[PDB]
Symmetry: C4
Subunit: 349 residues, 4 copies
Amino acid sequence: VPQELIEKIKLISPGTELRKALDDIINANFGALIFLVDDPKKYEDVIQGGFWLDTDFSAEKLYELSKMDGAIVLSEDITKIYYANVHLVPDPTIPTGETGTRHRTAERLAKQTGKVVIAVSRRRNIISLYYKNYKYVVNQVDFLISKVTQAISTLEKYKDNFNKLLSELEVLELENRVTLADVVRTLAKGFELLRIVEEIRPYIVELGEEGRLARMQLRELTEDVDDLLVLLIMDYSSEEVEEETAQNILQDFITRREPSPISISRVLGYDVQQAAQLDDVLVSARGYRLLKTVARIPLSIGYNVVRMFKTLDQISKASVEDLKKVEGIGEKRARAISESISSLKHRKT
Amino acid sequence: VPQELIEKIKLISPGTELRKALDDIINANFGALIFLVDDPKKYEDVIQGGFWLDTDFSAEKLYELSKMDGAIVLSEDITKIYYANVHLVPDPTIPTGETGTRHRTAERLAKQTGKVVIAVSRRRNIISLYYKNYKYVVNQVDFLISKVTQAISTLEKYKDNFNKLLSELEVLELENRVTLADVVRTLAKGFELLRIVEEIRPYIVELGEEGRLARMQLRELTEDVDDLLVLLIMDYSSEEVEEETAQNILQDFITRREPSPISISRVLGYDVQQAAQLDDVLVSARGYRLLKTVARIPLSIGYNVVRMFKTLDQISKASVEDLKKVEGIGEKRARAISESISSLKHRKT
Amino acid sequence: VPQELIEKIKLISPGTELRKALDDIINANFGALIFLVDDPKKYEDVIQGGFWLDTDFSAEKLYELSKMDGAIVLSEDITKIYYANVHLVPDPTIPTGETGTRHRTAERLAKQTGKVVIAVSRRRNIISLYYKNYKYVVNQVDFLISKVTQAISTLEKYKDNFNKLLSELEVLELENRVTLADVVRTLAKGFELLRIVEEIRPYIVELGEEGRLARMQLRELTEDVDDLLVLLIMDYSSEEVEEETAQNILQDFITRREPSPISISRVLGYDVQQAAQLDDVLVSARGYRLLKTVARIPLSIGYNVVRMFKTLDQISKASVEDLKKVEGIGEKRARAISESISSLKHRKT
Amino acid sequence: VPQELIEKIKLISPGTELRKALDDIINANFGALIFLVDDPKKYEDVIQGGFWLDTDFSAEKLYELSKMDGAIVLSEDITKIYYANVHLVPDPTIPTGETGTRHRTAERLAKQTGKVVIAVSRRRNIISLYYKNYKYVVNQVDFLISKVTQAISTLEKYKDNFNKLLSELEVLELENRVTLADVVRTLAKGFELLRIVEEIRPYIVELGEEGRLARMQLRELTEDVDDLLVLLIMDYSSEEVEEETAQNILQDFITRREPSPISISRVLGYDVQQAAQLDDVLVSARGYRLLKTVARIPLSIGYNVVRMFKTLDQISKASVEDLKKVEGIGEKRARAISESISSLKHRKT
Ligand SMILES: Nc1ncnc2c1ncn2[C@@H]1O[C@@H]2COP(=O)(O)O[C@H]3[C@@H](O)[C@H](n4cnc5c(N)ncnc54)O[C@@H]3COP(=O)(O)O[C@H]2[C@H]1O
Ligand SMILES: Nc1ncnc2c1ncn2[C@@H]1O[C@@H]2COP(=O)(O)O[C@H]3[C@@H](O)[C@H](n4cnc5c(N)ncnc54)O[C@@H]3COP(=O)(O)O[C@H]2[C@H]1O
Ligand SMILES: Nc1ncnc2c1ncn2[C@@H]1O[C@@H]2COP(=O)(O)O[C@H]3[C@@H](O)[C@H](n4cnc5c(N)ncnc54)O[C@@H]3COP(=O)(O)O[C@H]2[C@H]1O
Ligand SMILES: Nc1ncnc2c1ncn2[C@@H]1O[C@@H]2COP(=O)(O)O[C@H]3[C@@H](O)[C@H](n4cnc5c(N)ncnc54)O[C@@H]3COP(=O)(O)O[C@H]2[C@H]1O
């Protein structure tokens, strides 16, 4: 979705005085046909008749003005009301797939002037915004909150299965009994989870000020899933992988690549064709996840610890002194790794 | 519900251009009486007057056309609009239990031609689809999402009690202190849970594209309950039972047989009449559930392990070598069974 | 609420053909004034004019008939439609606090005949049912599901705090470190929880067939709270108390007595005035809760075990043989008590 | 928000007969312009024409009276209806930013008389209450329950992350491995959580009797978060802090100060500028949280225990006798501290 159009959809997002007026116009079954321009003079050929107002804009003035036939002309920044009750006359030969004279006039005029045109018909209750060759239908807040509420509810469900997989994987990690199947199942779920988010983002945006609580909900639910997934890929990929690299694999399984078990294991560096094979491939965490999250060791110094010990299993067998031989590890970060790792083995297994 | 009718209900499911038009017609309080046929000529006797259109179909064309009196005739695949404003004249002697001339004409005509007929009255806001001797009332999306949201909410509650029973049964399983009552209580709940799903499936289907999130929610909630229940029946039935057999018992307690404590224990091979008896019948898991789910041993090779050890208790007392004597168990699947079982005993008890 | 009136509210509960018609009448803004009697002849003095129908009842017939002025007369069992468009003439001197001629006529006539009278005004959308000196306003399904959904949601919250208290009390019970404060806090919460249920029951009832899922939700949420609370009172009351007695204390703290910390401890047999005192009163479970729920020992035989050991602490120190000396305890119920108790001490503490 | 205005908003809160009438007026699209005064005589100059009623007030009388043009005059306590159909004539020169003659008359008249004036336009469906120079727009119940339901839902999410942080911090506390970062992260979340509450309080208030369940939900969710947060600040602040002091820091991070990681640690007495520094600052709980909550030791006597041992670590190493040397600690409070602390170390780590 063009960012050029996003800045336009903002103009009529919940919270703006312009949207407040549109809502009143819809609820009042009045019609609306708004033309947004910066210099009316430059477009005096597509604007006929009506009344020249040139007054400050307000929701109430726009609402009252929409009680009349025709179009209203506003300054692009929505701070002025230039015309009212005018006859918009764009080129009739410009292509349009819209219905009704108001909408066909809207799209045509937007294309022609490269400006924004808003249309609201008395019959239906949708807000249609035309920019250039773009068309965006703005849904009512209640429809959006309905979809959003459902999505969030779906995410809770996914986040739950994710936590269960992750806590079970944790046990397998400490006991060094992890299989590729286990890792993939966890990654798969986390990928799916983040796709849901990406797919509802636009909905959140159309909510504007009414999207406040939904953003807060999403943030609590996906708080650290991304870092956790990147750390998982760094700990189980076939061969050493930099964080930046891992972040791309994540991004890639959220936009394009489908989180398929076989597909995920493949991109991780494991050559498999049969899904059943995964349960046979034994793997061992490198140790990044446990070093940054629990041991609170910066990923940068973690690279050194991994370099010298290779896996979490060897790191958990290391001693405070051994660890101290690592570049970036003093006495504090040494006991941190040690105690934190031993603590988890005693409590989770 | 006939599958022949399901393919028809799809024609007007949320997501289709045809339903989009019907919704606009309802919201606009216009009436509608649609006749779907492939060859108009063949039915020129039930079609009188109106205008011959023979144009491509579109939601907007149908919406506008419904502003006129009479019926609209469309091609069965909803890609053409043949007539508009016609007078449908089915045989008045065909039985009908409907009200109002529009609906009685609808059902009669559907019966007569064996074709689909849709009726929407200006007064009410329901979509009535007539096929042959079938009649399906399509509810609005908001009514469906309301029922569905409640059901899902009810399932969460059931899934919770299910997890609690299952985790407690787990403890009893490892400690080999399981009683028939325990197993039945768990099976009962899982059966109830899956019935809820089956009973709301039709609702999900009427939602069409608006059922996307509801399907995803249901899938996370019932992710593996079915396999888990089949494995429970295989581990506690009175005498050895094949998976296929277990799958039928499950299916049977989801469609016909009521998940009654006494009824479930009975079908499991235990002869009981008094509910209080269950707490007295001591039972021991065969070990399938723990072998496939935790040990990730294919059910097929599991049959061999069960054959040689009979119960989970004996399997947990077996050694890596002992297990290796089983057909299908090498060194990996041997340690898998061993370590996984011992791991659970140490963590859960 | 009189049970005599409950049987009347059923007549217009969601699911009945009569309510289906009323809903259509409300949605269509038609008015309604229904008089339910068994023998029209006996009331020919309060019924003037109109048309004598004496036909089978149906929602459609009632809906159509309500398009006319006046009242409709139906048989008490709603299987016949006697009159339509009649003028109901009850005694004008009968007291009534209602507004508008339709409602004042309704209440007056119900009082006079001791029969049921239903009124629906075109203006508002409520269903008013008059019986004798009773008046019941039936709310729409959407309003009910809204309140119910909130209550259920509130219960989840309470059930959560209840589980947390109960699981913590469990730890204190096994470790024999329970204080009166702990018990009261748990009882208090469970009492509150069940009050919520009692207070929303009427709402559930007004929902009729639309209350199906709400009943199922409530049942999962309050599944065994009552037995659990009775067992708590039996295990911590100041002196030995029979189950029946405990069940009355529960019932009493759900209807009359407010679940006050000081009030609860008082009724339990402990003489306290200051809330802060509770944290000082040391108490020890008798053992009923653990014997019936976990050990699955019938409350009747439990009385014997408690008799001989007094507290759970002594029971957990008892041996299989010791327990066998109890009337009703063989070898199975002996190991049951033993293993189950020791199992919990090892897992929870 | 002035408390003087709060007492006014109550007059039209859900549950009051006055609001019941307003709702009926809105649903009936009638207009309303109410003037509340105690002595009509004193204002006979702003009141012209209409009918002098001087009758008892009732929702039905007000509803019927609003069917006429003009304003209605009521006694300030809403127990009398003085005028109806009058012409309110406030000073036209009083400033007003309202639209339409009804609203401009409302605000002007409220300012002039310092009395309350209510306005409801036929077009829209909002209730505008004017007091002095204050203006309060009362939203419908459905809009409020929607926002509230979302907020509560958002809180659940926060309360969850809070519990997870707190339970993890618990482990670190017992193991005496707590870092400033850990404490701040937990405090931050709890602060955020309580802000949500404060920010939705006004919504709850506008709900009146329809806010009952929402208040109960909030109470279960935030049951003891405040005490828990105060105890956290007392246990980890840089230097000894009195409860009253801690309560102010809490209050301050809920109203003004933003719960910023760096900002929180700073106010706790730790001099830091870089967020990354927190993970390096080792800290140790004083022991208040564990003494009051678990050991149930009054905060007052806790001060003594902390005085003599300084930290929870030393308290957990203390013996029953050692503790007995503390002012306020006998044998019971001595074993309480001991057993409770050792119990937690054995179960959580
Ligand atoms: N060139 C044409 N070809 C066919 N029919 C024509 C027509 N011009 C006008 N009409 C018919 O007149 C109806 C109402 O015209 P109206 O100006 O009141 O009411 C109009 C007008 O206030 C506004 N509008 C449409 N186009 C406009 C334009 N180019 N400039 C300013 N306002 C416009 O939208 C309203 C409704 O449009 P809608 O099509 O639903 O309804 C149209 C249409 O059925
Ligand atoms: N044979 C008959 N017996 C008794 N009354 C008769 C009748 N024929 C017509 N009417 C009366 O005229 C009303 C409206 O006729 P209309 O054609 O405008 O408006 C009709 C028409 O546009 C459509 N419709 C009904 N039957 C149809 C058919 N066989 N073919 C095409 N359109 C039909 O549905 C609309 C409403 O039907 P509705 O019954 O509610 O309303 C009917 C009914 O009260
Ligand atoms: N004795 C009286 N005193 C003062 N005003 C009188 C009156 N009798 C009739 N009216 C006026 O006429 C209005 C409509 O009469 P209507 O018979 O059409 O329409 C009536 C009628 O169909 C029905 N209804 C009321 N009382 C009834 C009765 N005793 N028997 C049968 N139907 C009744 O309810 C409808 C609306 O009643 P609503 O009061 O809202 O509206 C009443 C009222 O304002
Ligand atoms: N001084 C003035 N300047 C410009 N226009 C004037 C005017 N006085 C009256 N009107 C026009 O007449 C409309 C309706 O007057 P109305 O008395 O029926 O119906 C009125 C009246 O019943 C009530 N209302 C307004 N001001 C009032 C006042 N000072 N005292 C009592 N009632 C008032 O609110 C209704 C609607 O007001 P609304 O402005 O929407 O609608 C107004 C407005 O467009």
